[PDB]
Structure 1
């Protein structure tokens, strides 16, 4: 699963990072793993897919100062998005804690956004109605309720 929270910038999960066919379908060109396991190297499928990787080691603990990676991560995302065709997936191993933090920092550092504006941008773009049929069904309910009879 992944959401395009900023043009060319996908905030996704570990399963998406592990899905060779989907990464290919989406045309991902860069992957930023916000929770790289030190005993591992670059994910096996990336070289073939033509994906450039950056693995930052971080624990999802209030005691870990993620600030240490703000610049390097933002610089990497910037390099990826600065080139036409650049599409980057940012993810971590469990939820979106470490990944979302690096994305927000990037938006703040490269697009002049305040933290509140960055949070809004990301949250507004994390979809909750992926099923086109369900969307159609909800829009139908909406018209009925907003308009009433006749």
Structure 2
């Protein structure tokens, strides 16, 4: 009927972290939630050219408005569970983000359902691979602008990426 401080901590980490539906966390890189992904007017207003859905649903498929908005789309199916292997998506998502930003005027929304875990993981991987931030560095840069908390398993995967990169 009682717990230890570690389980309390895990519960506390499910508290409020997100303040807006999306935040620019890197020049031209917005990180946000499903609402922003479905907000045609805001996607219009912000000049969104690429969308990376890190929570792609085979049921809902590619949002129908993105064609009318000129949006290049990449959905990856992913589940926000410490047991899920998000690393299968690191390089394909990073490359996508790189070529979105590489384009003059390019602007990308990376999103999940909440915008704090699946999506945040791929952004942090993108900064590690393409800008050579440490895992801790990328976390500090992103959390300056959006309260992120990748699940424990995604953090363990990002730590392993951090290890492998810093060696080579």
Contact 1:36 / 1:55 at 8 angstroms: preserved in 2? yes
| Deviation (angstroms), 1:38 | 1.7
Match of 1:24 in 2: 44
Worse overlay, 90-99 or 76-85: 90-99
Q: CA deviation at 1:25?
A: 0.3
Change (3 A) 1:33 1:146: closer
Structure 1: gaps (5+ residues): none
Distance 1:80 1:67 in 2: 20
The alignment partner of 1:133 has SS state of helix
SS of aligned partner of 2:148:
coil
Q: Shift of residue 39 of structure 1?
A: 2.5
> Are 2:72 and 1:52 equivalent residues in the alignment?
yes
Report deviation, 1:137.
42
**Is 2:33–2:112's contact at 8 Å kept on the other side of the alignment?**
yes
Q: Indicate the SS of the match to 2:24.
A: strand
Gaps of 5+ in 2: 1-20
Runs of at least 4 residues of structure 1 off by over 6 A? 127-148
Contact 2:49/2:71 (<8 A) preserved: yes
Q: Flag the 1:86–1:33 CA change in 2: closer, same or farther, 3 A.
A: same
Give the superposed CA RMSD: 11.9
Assess, with a 3 A threshold, how the Cα gap between structure 1 residues 119 and 144 changes in structure 2: closer, same or farther: closer
Aligned CA distance change for structure 1 residues 28 and 64 (closer, same or farther; 3 Å): same
The 1:84–1:63 alpha-carbon spacing in structure 2 relative to 1, beyond 3 Å, is same
| TM-score using structure 2 length | 0.74
- Are 1:8 and 1:87, in contact at CA under 8 Å, matched by a contact in 2? yes
Number of residue-to-residue matches in the alignment? 148
Q: Given that residues 117 and 150 in structure 2 are in contact (C-alpha distance below 8 angstroms), is that contact kept between their aligned partners in structure 1? A: no
In the alignment, what sits opposite 2:57? Answer: 37
Kindly name which structure, 1 or 2, has the bigger radius of gyration based on alpha carbons: 1
Residue 43 of structure 1 and its aligned partner are, at CA, apart by: 0.5
Task: Quote how far apart the aligned CAs of 1:133 are.
Answer: 39
Tell me the TM-score normalised to structure 1 length.
0.82
Rounded to whole Å, the distance in 1 between the matches of 2:86 and 2:164 is 48
